[PDB]
Amino acid sequence: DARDLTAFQKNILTVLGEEARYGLAIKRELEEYYGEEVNHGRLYPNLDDLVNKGLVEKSELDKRTNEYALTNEGFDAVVDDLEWTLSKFVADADRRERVETIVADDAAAL
Amino acid sequence: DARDLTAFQKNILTVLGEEARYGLAIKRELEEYYGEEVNHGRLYPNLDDLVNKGLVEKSELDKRTNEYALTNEGFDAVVDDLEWTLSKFVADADRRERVETIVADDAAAL
Ligand SMILES: [Br-]
Ligand SMILES: [Br-]
Ligand SMILES: [Br-]
Ligand SMILES: [Br-]
Ligand SMILES: [Br-]
Ligand SMILES: [Br-]
Numbered sequence: 001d002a003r004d005l006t007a008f009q010k011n012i013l014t015v016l017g018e019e020a021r022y023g024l025a026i027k028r029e030l031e032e033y034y035g036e037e038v039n040h041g042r043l044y045p046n047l048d049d050l051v052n053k054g055l056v057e058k059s060e061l062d063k064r065t066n067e068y069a070l071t072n073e074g075f076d077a078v079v080d081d082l083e084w085t086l087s088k089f090v091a092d093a094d095r096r097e098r099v100e101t102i103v104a105d106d107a108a109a110l
Numbered sequence: 111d112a113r114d115l116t117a118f119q120k121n122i123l124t125v126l127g128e129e130a131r132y133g134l135a136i137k138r139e140l141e142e143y144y145g146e147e148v149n150h151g152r153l154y155p156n157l158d159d160l161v162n163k164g165l166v167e168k169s170e171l172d173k174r175t176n177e178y179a180l181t182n183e184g185f186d187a188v189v190d191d192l193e194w195t196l197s198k199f200v201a202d203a204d205r206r207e208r209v210e211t212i213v214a215d216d217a218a219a220l
């Protein structure tokens with residue numbers, strides 16, 4: 001099940017939920033999130049795991065540059081965890097208003 | 111800085127983001143999420159870690175009965191990951207409408 005993934009693996013799926021990204025690009029996003037370096041020896045072995053699980057698709061582009069993207073299963077895993085997270089956070093009216101402001105501010109910033 | 115927590119520890123925080131809960135109640139909420147049994151030996155050592163990290167506060171109500179609640183830092187860690195998750199999910203109008211609908215159905219269930 002996708003609910004048993006590690007936090008690092010779930011964060012990869014989150015990064016790819018925004019848009020498909022080259023391996024090097026995923027590293028940058030994760031490094032910005034964690035605020036610390038992400039070693040090559042950790043990212044790509046986990047990317048391969050997500051590909052084997054059917055959650056991520058690997059597209060080998062021209063020359064040694066790979067683009068990773070969420071599969072339909074991967075996207076469902078991202079939505080599933082978001083729905084559960086929101087089911088626990090939206091516990092009253094103030095919580096709802098907080099999430100709606102976040103969503104609205106993010107969308108306007110697009 | 112709680113972005114390095116394990117997925118299991120983060121799920122404990124998410125459970126307590128809804129409301130303070132007894133230890134046994136946390137176990138139930140996690141088992142409903144994972145769809146599998148959560149061992150006593152896995153939950154409580156992680157609760158003790160979250161308490162040592164200052165993210166959860168433990169109140170001993172009775173013998174072998176304790177209630178756990180988020181600290182301010184714990185709640186900040188929950189909102190932090192939700193904000194990052196939403197900043198990546200809300201990538202277009204369709205993504206905004208979906209999250210708006212998720213939040214609306216959660217509020218309706220209250
Ligand atoms: Br899986
Ligand atoms: Br992890
Ligand atoms: Br997580
Ligand atoms: Br990219
Ligand atoms: Br690459
Ligand atoms: Br790049």
Ligand SMILES: [Br-]
Pocket residue numbers: 037038039042
């Ligand atoms: Br690392």
Ligand SMILES: [Br-]
Pocket residue numbers: 040041042044045
């Ligand atoms: Br490697």
Ligand SMILES: [Br-]
Pocket residue numbers: 081082083085195
């Ligand atoms: Br989530």
Ligand SMILES: [Br-]
Pocket residue numbers: 083084087
């Ligand atoms: Br759910």
Ligand SMILES: [Br-]
Pocket residue numbers: 092093096217220
């Ligand atoms: Br409400």
Ligand SMILES: [Br-]
Pocket residue numbers: 094095098
């Ligand atoms: Br709030």
Ligand SMILES: [Br-]
Pocket residue numbers: 111112163
């Ligand atoms: Br921490």
Ligand SMILES: [Br-]
Pocket residue numbers: 005006007008115116117118
């Ligand atoms: Br983990």
Ligand SMILES: [Br-]
Pocket residue numbers: 005006007116117118119
């Ligand atoms: Br874990």
Ligand SMILES: [Br-]
Pocket residue numbers: 130131132135
């Ligand atoms: Br409870």
Ligand SMILES: [Br-]
Pocket residue numbers: 132133134174175176177
């Ligand atoms: Br307890």
Ligand SMILES: [Br-]
Pocket residue numbers: 132134135
């Ligand atoms: Br209980």
Ligand SMILES: [Br-]
Pocket residue numbers: 085191192193195
């Ligand atoms: Br989250």
Ligand SMILES: [Br-]
Pocket residue numbers: 193194195197
């Ligand atoms: Br953010």
Ligand SMILES: [Br-]
Pocket residue numbers: 107108110202203206
């Ligand atoms: Br929009």
Ligand SMILES: [Br-]
Pocket residue numbers: 204205208
């Ligand atoms: Br969508």
